Ligand binder design. Structure first.
Ligand code: MET
Ligand SMILES: [Zn+2]
Ligand SMILES: [Zn+2]
Length: 598
C-alpha cells in the first residue's frame, strides 16, 4: 500500500485541477451515429426468444451484462449504440401460438411487450429494442442472400421427408412411429429403434405412422437451400486469425470457435418448411422460409435499420466501428461462424464482431430455472418481491458467471446486501453526506491536504484506473469489486480520523474534520459515477443527494477529480440501502423454491 512520490504528486495535481479538467459535454444525438476519428462502440445483446419469459439467468448473461458495458462506454464519451430486440420467427412460435389460441403475430406482439416491460424495470438502457418480424428484416435478409447466391455460396438439393397428408406437414423424427427394418420392433421411432439400438433415418421405417393422427405418411422430396460453409471456411479463418489475438473475446468463446473449425465446417440448411419466417425469394419456395438461425443474426442489422436510415454507417463500416456482442455460450457458433461466413461471402464490407462476450450459465440454487416446475426467479416475478431492481443488478453482477458457472442464492443475496451495500458502500456514502449536512450546514468544507490525505487520494486514483483497466476489457465482475475497494478504503479513512468527534474540538481539530469530510464526499461523488453502470438508480440518488452537477455525472475521467469544491451545497441526505431480513428472505426463497408448485 505504498506508492511513489511521483504517483502521489501527480494524482494530487489532477485532483486540485478540479472541474476545469472536464470537457463541456456534447449534446445527445438521435440517432447515434459513428463519428470519424472518435471511438464508435456498437453493442448487441443476444435477441431473446420472444415467447419465453426470461429468468435471471437469461438477463445476467445478455441484456444486463451488455447494459453495464454500454453505460460505461457512454461515460467514456464513446459514441455508443446499444441495441437488442425479440427473436420471434420459428416453429416454436407456431406451436405456442396455436396452444394459446392466437396467431403467430398476436402471440409475438403480446410477449414482446412482456420482454420490454421486464427490461425497462431492470433499467436496461437500450438505444433500440426492436423486432425480427419487420419488412426491413425481409429486405436485408434477402439482399445478403442474393449477394451469397450470385457468388456461389448457396447450394440447392432435394430431401426425402416423411409427410403426413392429413396433418398437411412434414414430420419430425419424434412425431413418426414405425416398425424397425433391422429387428422388426413394431414401435420404433424415426430417429432410433430402442429395441436393437440402431440409429436410423425415419424414411427407412416400414409402415410409418404419424403419432398425431395415426395416418400413413408418404415420402416426399422437398427442395432446400444450403450455405456452403466449406467454401467460406478459408476467408473466415483469415478474419479470425486477424482479429482474435489481443482481443477480448471471452476464453470460452474462442475455444468453442476454434473447436468447431477443428472438426471442419459443413454445409448448413438455411430453409424450413414453415409459414412463419422470412420468405425466400426463389422459384419454388413459395411455401418455405429461411431457417431462423440463418437470419436471426441479421436481426441485429434490421433492428438498427428500423431505427435509422444510416444503419449501414454502423454495420458496413469496420474501420470506424468496434462491435461488442454479448450472448450465452450456446449462441457463439452463430456469431463467430455462421454470420461471419454469410457476411464475408456477401462481400459488402460488413462490420464484424471485434470482441465476443459469452458467459457461462447462472444456476438457480442447487439446480436450474424451470417455469415448468415453478423453480427460480423469472423477470416478471422480480417486480413483486419488494426488492428494488438495483439490488438485483448488484447481486447478479457480483456473481456474474464469467470463467465458470455461478449459482443464485437467497442466503448469499442477503449476506452480500448487508455486508457490501449496507455495512460498506452505503455506510461510507451515508457518513460522508451526513457529515456535510450536519456539521457544515450542507456546504462542502475547506480541504487542507495532509500527506496521509494525499496517499488516500492517490490510492483512490489507482483503484479508479484499475477499474478502467478492467471494464475496458469487459471484466464486469472485477470492476464492481474495485468500487467496493475504494469504498472500503474510504470507510477506513473516516474511521481512523473520527471527524464526528474532532469536530467538537480545538481550532486545529475542526479543520482536520472538515478536510476529511470534504475529501470523503468527493470520493462519494466519484463512487456514484463508477456505480452508474451497475446501479443507475442509486447512482442518480446519490447524485441527487449531493447535487452533483450534470457534467460531472456524465463522464468518468481516469483521474480522481474534486467535483465538489469547498463551498458546494449538497441536497438532503438519506440512507442509501435497506437491510435484508432473514424472515423476508426465507419467505421469498420458499416462494421460488418449487415446494409451492401447482
Ligand atoms: C440473434 S441472437 C438469438 C438468440 C436466441 N433467441 C436464443 O435465445 O438463443
Ligand atoms: Zn430394431
Ligand atoms: Zn398426421
Amino acid at each position: 500500500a505504498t506508492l511513489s512520490e511521483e504517483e502521489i504528486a501527480m494524482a494530487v495535481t489532477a485532483w486540485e485541477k478540479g472541474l476545469e479538467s472536464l470537457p463541456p459535454l456534447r449534446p445527445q444525438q438521435n440517432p447515434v451515429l459513428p463519428v470519424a476519428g472518435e471511438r464508435n462502440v456498437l453493442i448487441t445483446s443476444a435477441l431473446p426468444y420472444v415467447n419465453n419469459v426470461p429468468h435471471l439467468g437469461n438477463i445476467i448473461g445478455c441484456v444486463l451484462s451488455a447494459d453495464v458495458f454500454a453505460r460505461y462506454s457512454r461515460l467514456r464519451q464513446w459514441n455508443t449504440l446499444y441495441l437488442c430486440g425479440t427473436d420471434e420467427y420459428g416453429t416454436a412460435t407456431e406451436t405456442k401460438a396455436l396452444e394459446e389460441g392466437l396467431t403467430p403475430q398476436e402471440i409475438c406482439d403480446k410477449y414482446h411487450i412482456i420482454h420490454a416491460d421486464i427490461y425497462r424495470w431492470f433499467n436496461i438502457s437500450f438505444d433500440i429494442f426492436g423486432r425480427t418480424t419487420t419488412p426491413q428484416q425481409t429486405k436485408i435478409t434477402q439482399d445478403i442472400f442474393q449477394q451469397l447466391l450470385k457468388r456461389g455460396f448457396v447450394l440447392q438439393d432435394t430431401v426425402e421427408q416423411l409427410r403426413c397428408e392429413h396433418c398437411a406437414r412434414f414430420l419430425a423424427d419424434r412425431f413418426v412411429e414405425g416398425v424397425c427394418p433391422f429387428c422388426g420392433y413394431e414401435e420404433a421411432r424415426g430417429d432410433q429403434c430402442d429395441k436393437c439400438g440402431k440409429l436410423i433415418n425415419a424414411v427407412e421405417l416400414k409402415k410409418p405412422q404419424c403419432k398425431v393422427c395415426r395416418s400413413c405418411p408418404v415420402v416426399q422430396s422437398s427442395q432446400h437451400l444450403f450455405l456452403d460453409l466449406p467454401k467460406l471456411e478459408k476467408r473466415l479463418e483469415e478474419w479470425l486469425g486477424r482479429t482474435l489475438p489481443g482481443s477480448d473475446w471471452t476464453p470460452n468463446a474462442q475455444f468453442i470457435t476454434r473447436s468447431w473449425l477443428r472438426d471442419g465446417l459443413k454445409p448448413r440448411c438455411i430453409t424450413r418448411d414453415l409459414k412463419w419466417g422470412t420468405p425466400v425469394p426463389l422459384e419454388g419456395f413459395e411455401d418455405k422460409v429461411f431457417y431462423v438461425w440463418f437470419d436471426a443474426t441479421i436481426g441485429y442489422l434490421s433492428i438498427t435499420a428500423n431505427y435509422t436510415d444510416q444503419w449501414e454507417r454502423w454495420w458496413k463500416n469496420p474501420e470506424q466501428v468496434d462491435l461488442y456482442q454479448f450472448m450465452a455460450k450456446d449462441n457463439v457458433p452463430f456469431h463467430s461462424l455462421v454470420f461471419p461466413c454469410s457476411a464475408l461471402g456477401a462481400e459488402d464490407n460488413y462490420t464484424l464482431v471485434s470482441h465476443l462476450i459469452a458467459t457461462e450459465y447462472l444456476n438457480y440454487e442447487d439446480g436450474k430455472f424451470s417455469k415448468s416446475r415453478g423453480v427460480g426467479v423469472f423477470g416478471d416475478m422480480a417486480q413483486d418481491t419488494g426488492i428494488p431492481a438495483d439490488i438485483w443488478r448488484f447481486y447478479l453482477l457480483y456473481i456474474r458467471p464469467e470463467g465458470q458457472d455461478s449459482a443464485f442464492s437467497w442466503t448469499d443475496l442477503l449476506l452480500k446486501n448487508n455486508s457490501e451495500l449496507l455495512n460498506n458502500l452505503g455506510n461510507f456514502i451515508n457518513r460522508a453526506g451526513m457529515f456535510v449536512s450536519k456539521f457544515f450546514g450542507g456546504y462542502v468544507p475547506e480541504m487542507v491536504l495532509t500527506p496521509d490525505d494525499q496517499r488516500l487520494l492517490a490510492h483512490v486514483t489507482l483503484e479508479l484506473q484499475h477499474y478502467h483497466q478492467l471494464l475496458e476489457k469487459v471484466r464486469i465482475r472485477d470492476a464492481l469489486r474495485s468500487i467496493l475497494t475504494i469504498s472500503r478504503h474510504g470507510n477506513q479513512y473516516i474511521q481512523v480520523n473520527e471527524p464526528w468527534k474532532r469536530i467538537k474540538g480545538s481550532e486545529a481539530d475542526r479543520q482536520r474534520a472538515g478536510t476529511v469530510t470534504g475529501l470523503a464526499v468527493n470520493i462519494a461523488a466519484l463512487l456514484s459515477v463508477m456505480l452508474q453502470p451497475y446501479m443507475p438508480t442509486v447512482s442518480a440518488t446519490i447524485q441527487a443527494q449531493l447535487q452533483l452537477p450534470p457534467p460531472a455525472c456524465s463522464i468518468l475521467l481516469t483521474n480522481f477529480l474534486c467535483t465538489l469544491p469547498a463551498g458546494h451545497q449538497i441536497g438532503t441526505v438519506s440512507p442509501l440501502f435497506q437491510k435484508l431480513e432473514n424472515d423476508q428472505i426465507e419467505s421469498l426463497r420458499q416462494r421460488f423454491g418449487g415446494g409451492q408448485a401447482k
